[PDB]
Every structure is written in C-alpha cells, then in structure tokens.
Write a protein that binds this ligand. Structure first.
Ligand code: NI
Length: 341
C-alpha cells in the first residue's frame, strides 16, 4: 500500500508510486526521475497517464517500452494544466531529466515536491521566487551535519588533473569509470575530453545515454572499445579482481588501470579534503573513491529550506526509523527558530 508521503492531498495525484498496484483514486502518476527506487513497477503493460520531463519520457519509451500514448512529457519552467490543476516542473540538479514539481491546489495551497535534488542558490531565482509554498516534500538523504562534501566543480577538477597526469606519464594506462544508473555523466565526459578520447561502453549503456539530450554526444561516446582509452563498466566490477580481468581483455594494449568510483558521501569526508584524496593500489591497478554527490549536503539543504520558509515539511527519505525521524524533526525546528519563520 502506497505511503502517505507519496500522495498529494486535494488531488488525484501520486509521486514516484509505481510499485503499489492500482492506487485507489489516483488519476495521474508523476515520475520525478529515472532511478529504479522511483520507477519500480513501470513497464510496457502500464496503462495510466504518466507525467514527467521529456528526458524521462525518452527513457520510459526506449528502456522500459512504455507505450507512447500513456507518456505525457511536460516542458520545464512552464505553467501546465493536468486534470484541472496547475503544475510546473523545475530542474532538480540531480541526474538528467530529474525534476521538482510545484502543485497549485484548487483551494489556494501551494505544494513543492523536490523529488531527489541537490539544492543550489540558482533555485532561488526560478518560478519559486514568485509565491509562497505551504507544504515541502523534501529529499532528506543527507539531513545531518556530518554530511559535508565539495562542490561538483572541485571534484571534476581533481578527476581531470589526476587522469591527465597519469596518462601523460604513461600513454599505455587505461582509465575506467564505474556506473550503475544515469547521473554523474560529467565524471567520465570530462576525463575523456581532457584526454582527447571517446568514452567506450556497452551497447545497453550507449542506448541509455542516447535518450538524454546531451549536446554533441555522438562526438563523446562510442561502443568501439578498441578506439577508446576511457572505458565505462558496471560499478560492481570496480574492484581489483574485476579490473584485472578487464585488463586481460584489452589484448596487451594497456599495462596499467586508473579507476574512479563516484560515490555520494563516505566517512573519509569528515577528515580529508578533496586535494588530499589518495587511491587504493594493488600492482598496476589504482582505485579512487571520489565524493561526487547529486544530493544536497546538510548546509545546502538548510539554506534552501531557510530561503523557502515552508509552513510544513514532509521528509521523503530516511523515514523508516524513529531515530531518523526524530533527528530530522529537531533540525527542521532549529532552522525555523534561527531564521524566524
Ligand atoms: Ni535518485
């Protein structure tokens, strides 16, 4: 049965609620982004209206074979009417095609559902600025002050400089980047660009990337591994055994691997600066864990909420334990008292 925090009151709407069968009284199902915990349940047999971004709708059609007649893509930053309710989709600064949803309820309440997001000051100048929000359904993934990480830009600087140094020192080194879902494409695209290479990957991953409207993509990715010195692999294969095996397969073209695992947060964040990150090494294989996050840090989340001044907050992440719920509720009260709303 669908949890309350996926239901939008005063409407026929649910958000990211595809794994509960037919939800009683749901007339339209919204999907914020194409990550499996959120799309779980969709397939070619789905026959209710799905509302989403253009990019999300490309993925639904091509990867999950959802029939076109039930996909309703909406433009961003545009007031649209769905089953008689005004809605707007806003960029969530998460993975490609990820949105936040503004609902303008018939009785005058305004509700923001962030989906998954990485809050940014740039959001303070979208259509959010123009009216009051009463209820906020918030991505609280990293809602605790221990969760600090660098900007995306510092993390990509570190990766580019690391890769460029290594390959310039040894032109027979291969760079490998791990992936398991869409998101974090900048990691592998920036490394390939500095090295003057295309990124090589499986046919299934190339298919996924071709749905994302990234400019000049035919110029940056390929399925011809032999012509590429930056290879993408499943995140599970980013370990010494899996990488030793891969290196075998390249037929003596390469004699060293430098690999990157983009994680979100890891406890080496509470001690070490990005400048100071070092790899795990075994033989001719090294592995860097880099803290490339597509969710808000604690400080970014705090700033956004203190800007928005919602009357009520509903967390959507970490809701399963009383200890987490109590922690989060204590931070929301602090933020409210400090800012004065
Ligand atoms: Ni996500």
């Amino acid at each position: 049965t669908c949890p309350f925090y996926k239901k939008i009151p005063g409407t026929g709407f649910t958000v990211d609620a595809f794994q509960y069968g037919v939800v009683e009284g749901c007339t339209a199902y919204f999907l914020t982004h194409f990550h499996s915990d959120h799309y779980a349940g969709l397939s070619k047999h789905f026959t209710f209206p799905v509302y989403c971004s253009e990019i999300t709708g490309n993925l639904l059609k091509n990867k999950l074979h959802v029939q076109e007649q039930y996909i309703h893509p909406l433009p961003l930053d545009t007031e649209c009417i769905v089953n008689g309710v005004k809605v707007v989709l806003l960029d969530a600064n998460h993975c490609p095609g990820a949105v936040m949803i503004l609902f303008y309820l018939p009785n005058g309440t305004v509700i923001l559902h962030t989906g998954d997001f990485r809050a940014d000051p740039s959001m303070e100048r979208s259509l959010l600025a123009d009216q009051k929000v009463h209820m906020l359904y918030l991505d609280t993934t990293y809602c605790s002050p221990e969760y600090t990480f660098p900007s995306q830009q510092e993390v990509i600087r570190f990766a580019i400089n690391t890769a460029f140094e290594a390959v310039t020192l040894n032109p027979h080194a291969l760079v490998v980047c791990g992936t398991y879902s869409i998101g974090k494409e900048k990691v592998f695209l920036a490394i390939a660009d500095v090295l003057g290479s295309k990124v090589g990957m499986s046919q299934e991953k190339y298919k996924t990337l071709q749905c994302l409207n990234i400019p000049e993509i035919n110029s940056l990715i390929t399925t011809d591994m032999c012509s590429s010195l930056v290879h993408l692999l499943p995140m599970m294969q980013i370990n010494f055994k899996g990488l030793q095996s891969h290196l075998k397969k390249c037929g003596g073209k390469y004699n060293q691997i430098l690999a990157f695992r983009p994680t979100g947060w890891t406890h080496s964040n509470k001690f070490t600066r990005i400048a100071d990150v070092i790899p795990q090494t075994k033989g001719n294989i090294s592995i860097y864990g880099i803290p490339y996050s597509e969710h808000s840090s604690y400080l970014e989340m705090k700033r956004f909420v203190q800007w928005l001044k919602p009357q009520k907050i509903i967390p959507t992440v970490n809701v399963g334990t009383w200890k987490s719920r109590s922690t989060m509720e204590k931070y929301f009260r602090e933020w409210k008292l400090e800012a004065g709303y």
